[PDB]
Enzyme design. Structure first.
Site, PDB file in Angstrom:
ATOM      1  N   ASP A 122      -2.717   9.294  -0.160  1.00 45.57           N
ATOM      2  CA  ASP A 122      -1.370   9.074  -0.219  1.00 45.57           C
ATOM      3  C   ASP A 122      -1.171   7.880  -1.240  1.00 45.57           C
ATOM      4  O   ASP A 122      -0.336   7.227  -1.073  1.00 45.57           O
ATOM      5  CB  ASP A 122      -0.764   8.819   0.942  1.00 45.57           C
ATOM      6  CG  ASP A 122       0.761   8.886   0.761  1.00 45.57           C
ATOM      7  OD1 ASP A 122       1.171   9.852  -0.155  1.00 45.57           O
ATOM      8  OD2 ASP A 122       1.575   8.375   1.213  1.00 45.57           O
ATOM      9  N   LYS A 124       0.452   6.037  -4.012  1.00 49.88           N
ATOM     10  CA  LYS A 124       1.763   5.859  -4.717  1.00 49.88           C
ATOM     11  C   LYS A 124       2.079   4.335  -5.038  1.00 49.88           C
ATOM     12  O   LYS A 124       1.761   3.458  -4.356  1.00 49.88           O
ATOM     13  CB  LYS A 124       2.768   6.568  -3.680  1.00 49.88           C
ATOM     14  CG  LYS A 124       2.520   7.689  -3.116  1.00 49.88           C
ATOM     15  CD  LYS A 124       3.663   8.402  -2.107  1.00 49.88           C
ATOM     16  CE  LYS A 124       4.129   7.006  -0.907  1.00 49.88           C
ATOM     17  NZ  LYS A 124       4.626   7.566   0.092  1.00 49.88           N
ATOM     18  N   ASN A 127       2.228   2.061  -2.000  1.00 49.22           N
ATOM     19  CA  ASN A 127       1.376   1.830  -1.232  1.00 49.22           C
ATOM     20  C   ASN A 127       0.448   0.868  -1.724  1.00 49.22           C
ATOM     21  O   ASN A 127      -0.673   0.590  -1.339  1.00 49.22           O
ATOM     22  CB  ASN A 127       0.547   3.147  -0.679  1.00 49.22           C
ATOM     23  CG  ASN A 127       1.463   3.900   0.211  1.00 49.22           C
ATOM     24  OD1 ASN A 127       2.424   3.517   0.703  1.00 49.22           O
ATOM     25  ND2 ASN A 127       0.968   5.259   0.398  1.00 49.22           N
ATOM     26  N   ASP A 143      -1.440   1.463   3.763  1.00 53.62           N
ATOM     27  CA  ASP A 143      -1.066   2.915   4.210  1.00 53.62           C
ATOM     28  C   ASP A 143      -2.131   4.123   4.448  1.00 53.62           C
ATOM     29  O   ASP A 143      -2.208   4.866   3.709  1.00 53.62           O
ATOM     30  CB  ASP A 143       0.122   3.406   3.775  1.00 53.62           C
ATOM     31  CG  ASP A 143       0.908   4.381   4.645  1.00 53.62           C
ATOM     32  OD1 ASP A 143       0.339   4.822   5.605  1.00 53.62           O
ATOM     33  OD2 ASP A 143       2.099   4.404   4.396  1.00 53.62           O
ATOM     34  N   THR A 161     -28.957  31.669   8.347  1.00 53.43           N
ATOM     35  CA  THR A 161     -28.780  32.966   7.334  1.00 53.43           C
ATOM     36  C   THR A 161     -27.135  33.310   7.429  1.00 53.43           C
ATOM     37  O   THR A 161     -26.602  33.244   8.537  1.00 53.43           O
ATOM     38  CB  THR A 161     -29.646  34.023   7.854  1.00 53.43           C
ATOM     39  OG1 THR A 161     -29.291  35.207   6.901  1.00 53.43           O
ATOM     40  CG2 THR A 161     -29.261  34.605   9.208  1.00 53.43           C
TER      41      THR A 161
HETATM   42  N1  WTI Z   1       3.325   1.387   4.581  1.00 51.46           N
HETATM   43  C1  WTI Z   1       2.634   0.512   4.950  1.00 51.46           C
HETATM   44  O1  WTI Z   1       1.463   0.750   5.601  1.00 51.46           O
HETATM   45  C2  WTI Z   1       2.887  -0.998   4.475  1.00 51.46           C
HETATM   46  C3  WTI Z   1       1.940  -2.209   4.928  1.00 51.46           C
HETATM   47  C4  WTI Z   1       2.194  -3.557   4.643  1.00 51.46           C
HETATM   48  C5  WTI Z   1       3.350  -3.721   3.717  1.00 51.46           C
HETATM   49  C6  WTI Z   1       3.788  -4.991   3.226  1.00 51.46           C
HETATM   50  C7  WTI Z   1       5.257  -4.879   2.472  1.00 51.46           C
HETATM   51  C8  WTI Z   1       5.616  -6.356   2.228  1.00 51.46           C
HETATM   52  C9  WTI Z   1       6.871  -6.647   1.429  1.00 51.46           C
HETATM   53  S1  WTI Z   1       7.756  -5.277   1.043  1.00 51.46           S
HETATM   54  C10 WTI Z   1       9.174  -5.883   0.287  1.00 51.46           C
HETATM   55  C11 WTI Z   1       9.027  -7.362   0.278  1.00 51.46           C
HETATM   56  C12 WTI Z   1       7.665  -8.018   1.250  1.00 51.46           C
HETATM   57  O2  WTI Z   1       6.902  -9.324   1.210  1.00 51.46           O
HETATM   58  C13 WTI Z   1       7.951 -10.132   0.515  1.00 51.46           C
HETATM   59  C14 WTI Z   1       9.437  -9.986   0.324  1.00 51.46           C
HETATM   60  O3  WTI Z   1       9.657  -8.643  -0.218  1.00 51.46           O
HETATM   61  C15 WTI Z   1       4.943  -7.672   2.395  1.00 51.46           C
HETATM   62  N2  WTI Z   1       3.597  -7.367   3.190  1.00 51.46           N
HETATM   63  C16 WTI Z   1       3.177  -6.332   3.682  1.00 51.46           C
HETATM   64  N3  WTI Z   1       1.895  -6.262   4.341  1.00 51.46           N
HETATM   65  C17 WTI Z   1       4.235  -2.630   3.161  1.00 51.46           C
HETATM   66  C18 WTI Z   1       3.935  -1.261   3.606  1.00 51.46           C
END
Ligand code: WTI
Length: 286
Positions: A122, A124, A127, A143, A161
């Site tokens: 996945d 993208k 992620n 993810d 076989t």
């Molecule tokens: N889909 C997932 O598994 C996953 C795991 C961790 C994170 C993640 C997102 C963020 C984000 S997203 C938008 C932000 C931010 O932090 C700063 C402020 O703006 C931070 N740490 C993470 N581990 C996303 C998806």
């Protein structure tokens, strides 16, 4: 509703980062963490946790804690830069050198997964996470809910076989073992988007079906946009957007491609690496 007591005991919950992912603070350290909430399911979670526990790589997110309760709570490293997605949406485009820095890390991460018998499935922009708000930063893959852990069935079948063995099974032997190549396709699409500000396959301004474009491999090439971009960069994309999974570039081949033989970019990456490691570097034996 409320958070589970075991969670509240170690962490102070806070604002939503993405509507789900929440900012939180570990009580013991007063350090920022990210907590991913998965509403109850079991299976994807089980594998994701098991994958995250065993993996150990700078460009792969680390798990800090887990809570199985009314819902599933997964505690992760906070990535301050957020999602790569938000850097490329609205036809925004990244400067080529940044695409190279980011993509190089993506390649190392994904190579590492393949080396360890894991297919992400996945990939993208959503992620892929940035470690800081600087445009020069570390990226980490996230993810693993859709991931696959590696034909053992077929392998057992080939022992013995095929007297009673159906034709379609034997035909599948040709391509057996190339599932990982779907990650390389995805990387190809990500790189395209990053370099051009737009996607290679869409239904916007076209009457050929998305499916058809993809199976044909006829991506929407818009010369105006691509003139800005190197021929080396574009070449790498072309070898990743190859319809035949056996011919498609592997992570190794991508890593040897001339576009990635760029000592400055590598140096900058190493720089950001040791800078992240300063936090935890114990003195050592000389
Ligand atoms: N889909 C997932 O598994 C996953 C795991 C961790 C994170 C993640 C997102 C963020 C984000 S997203 C938008 C932000 C931010 O932090 C700063 C402020 O703006 C931070 N740490 C993470 N581990 C996303 C998806």
């Amino acid at each position: 509703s409320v958070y589970p007591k075991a969670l509240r005991d170690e962490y102070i919950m806070s604002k939503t980062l993405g509507s789900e992912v929440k900012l939180a603070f570990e009580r013991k350290t007063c350090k920022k963490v990210a907590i991913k909430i998965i509403s109850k399911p079991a299976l994807n979670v089980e594998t994701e946790i098991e994958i995250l526990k065993k993996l150990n790589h700078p460009c792969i997110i680390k798990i800090k804690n887990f809570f199985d309760a009314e819902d599933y709570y997964i505690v992760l490293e906070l990535m301050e830069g957020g999602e790569l997605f938000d850097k490329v949406v609205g036809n925004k485009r990244l400067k080529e050198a940044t695409c190279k820095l980011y993509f190089y890390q993506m390649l190392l991460a994904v190579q590492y997964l393949h080396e360890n018998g894991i297919i992400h499935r996945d990939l993208k922009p959503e992620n892929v996470l940035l470690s800081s708000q600087e445009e020069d930063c570390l990226i980490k893959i996230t993810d693993f809910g859709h991931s696959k852990i590696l034909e053992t069935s077929l392998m057992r079948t080939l022992c013995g076989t095929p007297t009673y063995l159906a034709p379609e099974v034997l035909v599948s032997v040709g391509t057996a073992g190339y599932n990982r190549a779907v990650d390389c396709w995805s990387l190809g699409v990500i790189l395209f988007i990053c370099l051009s500000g737009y996607p290679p396959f869409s239904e916007h301004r076209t009457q050929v079906s998305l499916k058809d474009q993809i199976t044909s491999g006829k991506y929407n090439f818009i010369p105006e946009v691509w003139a800005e971009v190197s021929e080396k960069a574009l070449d790498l994309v072309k070898k990743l957007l190859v319809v035949d999974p056996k011919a498609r570039f592997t992570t190794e081949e991508a890593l040897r491609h001339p576009w990635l033989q760029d000592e400055d970019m590598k140096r900058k990456f190493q720089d950001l690496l040791s800078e992240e490691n300063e936090s935890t570097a114990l003195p050592q034996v000389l």
